[PDB]
DNA sequence: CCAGGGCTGATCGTGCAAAAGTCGTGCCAGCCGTCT
DNA sequence: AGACGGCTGGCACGACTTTTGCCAGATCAGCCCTGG
């Protein structure tokens, strides 16, 4: 559903999905690099909230 | 439709947040403790019978620290969504039903 | 007169041909509701 | 001379793995860049009405089937029909050969004659002669439909039948002797043929979007027009403070180190993206200064230039400017162009001056279009016209240019007045 | 494919009587989906393709 | 308790040049218009 | 009907643009160890 035609701007259905996808990708990429407990726990809390 | 792996465990907000608490009624755990443990700020204990500690009790960060420093590596505890999953998976239902 | 896709064309054909017969099938909105329910952690399906 | 292995002097060069990555960084588009930059951001932890309208549309092919449904036929006729009108373009002639369609049926019983039938039945549907299978006959079908009463009908029918080559090479002298038609009366038969709608499917789909994102902007504030970059487009990284305030107080070597390394990376990457931007604005700016000319004037008024021209106005190397110009589009009052574009070959005119080929090639297009239609201007004749202007191009240059503008030859654009 | 039953196989539905509802399993969710998404990118504006 | 020596790490660095590519213009072949 | 002139386009050959490919090192400053 593009409003102006140049940008589709999917709202209310793809924003949260995008949010969750990038946060889970960052968490999965950081969990393998032996990250400290505080950072990974904050990332998991943020993913849970998302 | 599609699927997402989500390597990290995640609870369903439709449960344990409605008028009746499903995880609460299954684990005999109050709502505040579950809400505090589902955000990495409660550090609930999973198992451990040798130490003088209850099965489902809240142990704060300093509390968990002084417990691990004294009892050693015996009082295993988790602070994430995996804690509820471990407390709900390693629990028989028929024995609890008979006890109730 | 509804979202049934496989029924509108058939009804139009029957009216143009003069048959006056209805084939209900199944509305698409029920399938959309099923998909939206399956989008969460709740299984749902129809038996036989 | 003599052969030996001595040593020379005076030069300057230096490079490293990480700096390299910083340099390739400006060679790729923001949209494609922001992708590369999102990827960095996963690796680095300290660097940060439901259906609206949804109006389902017609679609031509969709239109073709709606009448397929209310045409009467058998299951085999409705099967071939779905096959046929499955394979049909936006323009409307069919993509696949008819013998191919027979291979798509995979039935021994199915025959070419049977296909000839279902096809032709749906060949006069909506709009007229659609599913053509190579126009010549499409025209012939639309002819087919309307009344005998209109004059010159048989004439247009004769030509269209088997004298297509005659009309495509616009050799009307040959056409006249072959078809033995009227002198400058055939003209009107040909005019009939002219108004018959080639490409009758196109019509349906018309709703086409707006889509282009300008990198830079340049816009006539009082003369001396000034470049500013696109704010929305420009990518930007911002340091995470939480994690910045959790490196010192950190109690372990693992953690502490971990956090330092990343901060190092991160600060560097910021600084590198910041660089990209500045270059490109400095550079944008330096190219439109020289090419002040062009915006008001038109494509004709462009000065011929080389990268050197714009590299020596800045302090950067040539290659660097070459990497930053690729795929950036800069929006201006006149329109959207690629930044590449400005740059072209020169050719040497009269009076010592040089002319941008682009501008000459724009010039050729106006000159060739605005000519007597009975007598087309040939290339060499033009070369001579330009030479009056002073350009002194030569004839193959002009052929080159004249064929580049997707315009065919002079003897080939000749037509009846 | 004989191209005469493939089109008729599309327009087909079951009884669908006695619809039930229960909890979902990870195996069932994996069986419901065909592919896994990994990038938050929705659409590209260079060629307008998936 | 104060000055001297060691050592680690933090910091600074967007170009030079080699080869591939394009450019314009000429040379030559093949088709077509027109006069004899 | 045949030769001549014009037209176009392919291909070639210099003069000239442009596009990709490099990969540290040494040097300086603060802190810790040790001598005065």
Curated annotation (Swiss-Prot), chain C:
Acetylated on several lysine residues in the presence of glucose. Transmembrane segments: none annotated. It comes from the Bacteria. Co-administration of salinamide and rifampicin or salinamide and myxopyronin suppresses the emergence of resistance to both antibiotics. DNA-dependent RNA polymerase (RNAP) catalyzes the transcription of DNA into RNA using the four ribonucleoside triphosphates as substrates. The RNAP catalytic core consists of 2 alpha, 1 beta, 1 beta' and 1 omega subunit. When a sigma factor is associated with the core the holoenzyme is formed, which can initiate transcription. The rRNA transcription and antitermination complex (rrnTAC) consists of RNAP, NusA, NusB, NusE (rpsJ), NusG, SubB, ribosomal protein S4, DNA and precursor rRNA; S4 is more flexible than other subunits. In pull-down experiments interacts with CedA. Belongs to the RNA polymerase beta chain family. This is DNA-directed RNA polymerase subunit beta. It comes from Escherichia coli (strain K12). The lineage of its organism: Bacteria, Pseudomonadati, Pseudomonadota, Gammaproteobacteria, Enterobacterales. The gene is rpoB. The chain holds residues 1294 to 1341 of 1342 of the full protein.
Curated annotation (Swiss-Prot), chain E:
Co-administration of salinamide and rifampicin or salinamide and myxopyronin suppresses the emergence of resistance to both antibiotics. Acetylated on several lysine residues in the presence of glucose. It comes from the Bacteria. The RNAP catalytic core consists of 2 alpha, 1 beta, 1 beta' and 1 omega subunit. When a sigma factor is associated with the core the holoenzyme is formed, which can initiate transcription. The rRNA transcription and antitermination complex (rrnTAC) consists of RNAP, NusA, NusB, NusE (rpsJ), NusG, SubB, ribosomal protein S4, DNA and precursor rRNA; S4 is more flexible than other subunits. Belongs to the RNA polymerase beta' chain family. DNA-dependent RNA polymerase (RNAP) catalyzes the transcription of DNA into RNA using the four ribonucleoside triphosphates as substrates. This is DNA-directed RNA polymerase subunit beta'. The chain holds residues 2 to 51 of 1407 of the full protein.
